Amino acid sequence: MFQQLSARLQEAIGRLRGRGRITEEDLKATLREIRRALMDADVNLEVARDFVERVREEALGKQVLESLTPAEVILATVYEALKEALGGEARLPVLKDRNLWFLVGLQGSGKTTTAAKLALYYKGKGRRPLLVAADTQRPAAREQLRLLGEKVGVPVLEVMDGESPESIRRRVEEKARLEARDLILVDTAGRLQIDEPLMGELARLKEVLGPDEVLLVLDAMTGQEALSVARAFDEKVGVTGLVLTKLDGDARGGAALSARHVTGKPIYFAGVSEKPEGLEPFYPERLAGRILGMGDV
């Protein structure tokens, strides 16, 4: 993800090299080019306009027009604007004494495999996780998480067909007490679209289990639809943070860039492969530097 945009931002910056100091009109040209690059990456007009305005202000504050290397000033101000757009400071969930967390999202989002890779990440950090396969319609969606829990050495509780939220709560509390579980990761059901009985069911489970966090797992390769999905889940269920998967995929990147400010939720993790190990903390500085061709490729 972000190939064309990364190329197009780098090319805009590169066009400023070797020319001496630049003029006001030269700066305006570069700024429209950044705005176009963003919009071609599917950033909407308002977010792209805000981004460019930030770059303009910052670059003028660094006296870009008086620099012998204006490309470097633009690189720095684009970098920072990208970092800020992606969230600024890296963030994660608060771990406290009791940690019960929902993973929500659509079919194909990376939800179930993210649950398992999350289980493993936290086990490696000294937590003691329990995975809950919470689709009460589909034995095979539950199964799938079972075999991923075995892979990663993290225990699993599968809900029964049609199980009530109160029984789930009981069986989960019983197992958590018996097994000393101190991070319960609830893999809510995945469908192809927003199943409305689905959203209601999920809201009821949420009222009953009272999760500390509700993590919505979004496939980055699906585009602007992701931010509509985010709004829908936040309004029908209520979500506390994001995970963006398939950032290793080939796709534009503009919605991901816009997600922090559009959804108002932190991005805690990004999935970077199909493997259990392929989910790591989301580091706004790292994707931003990367996008601009700095650091480790």
Ligand X SMILES: Nc1nc2c(ncn2[C@@H]2O[C@H](COP(=O)(O)OP(=O)(O)CP(=O)(O)O)[C@@H](O)[C@H]2O)c(=O)[nH]1
* Three-state helix/strand/coil letters over the chain: CCHHHHHHHHHHHHCCCCCCCCCHHHHHHHHHHHHHHHHHCCCCHHHHHHHHHHHHHHHHHCCHHHCCCHHHHHHHHHHHHHHHHCCCCCCCCCCCCCCEEEEECCCCCCHHHHHHHHHHHHHHCCCCEEEEECCCCCHHHHHHHHHHHHHHCCCEEECCCCCCHHHHHHHHHHHHHHHCCCEEEEECCCCCCCCHHHHHHHHHHHHHHCCCEEEEEEEHHHCCHHHHHHHHHHHHCCCCEEEEECCCCCCCCHHHHHHHHHHCCCEEEEECCCCCCCEEECCHHHHHHHHCCCCCC
Q: Does residue 87 bind ligand X (CB under 6 A)?
A: no
Q: Does residue 266 bind ligand X (CB under 6 A)?
A: no
Q: Does residue 139 bind ligand X (CB under 6 A)?
A: no
Whether 264 has a binding-site annotation, put simply, is no
Q: Does residue 53 bind ligand X (CB under 6 A)?
A: no
Whether 97 has a binding-site annotation, put simply, is no
Q: Does residue 245 bind ligand X (CB under 6 A)?
A: yes
Piece in contact with ligand X (CB under 6 A), picked from 9-17, 73-81, 204-212, 241-249: 241-249
For residue 19, CA distances in Å to 16, 22, 26, 65, 112 come to 7, 7, 10, 12, 52
Q: Does residue 276 bind ligand X (CB under 6 A)?
A: no
- The residue number with the shortest CB distance to ligand X is 190
Rounded least distance, CB 46 to ligand X, Å: 29
Burial 231-257 (b: 16+ CB within 10 A, else e): eebbebbebbbbbbbbbeeebbbbbbb
Count of CB atoms within 10 A of residue 57's CB?
A: 12
Piece in contact with ligand X (CB under 6 A), picked from 24-32, 81-89, 199-207, 272-280: 272-280
Whether 164 has a binding-site annotation, put simply, is no
Q: Does residue 253 bind ligand X (CB under 6 A)?
A: no
Identify the residue among 14, 61, 153, 249 touching ligand X (CB under 6 A).
249
Q: Does residue 107 bind ligand X (CB under 6 A)?
A: yes
Identify the residue among 9, 141, 205, 259 touching ligand X (CB under 6 A).
141
Whether 254 has a binding-site annotation, put simply, is no
- Comparison of 75 and 256: residue with beta carbon closer to ligand X: 256
Rounded least distance, CB 210 to ligand X, Å: 22
Q: Does residue 57 bind ligand X (CB under 6 A)?
A: no
Piece in contact with ligand X (CB under 6 A), picked from 70-78, 150-158, 162-170, 266-274: 266-274
- Comparison of 173 and 248: residue with beta carbon closer to ligand X: 248
Site string for ligand X, 197-226 (x = CB under 6 A): ------------------------------
Whether 149 has a binding-site annotation, put simply, is no
The residue count for binding ligand X (CB under 6 A) is: 19
Binding stretches for ligand X (CB under 6 A): 107-113, 141, 144, 190, 245-246, 248-249, 271-274, 278
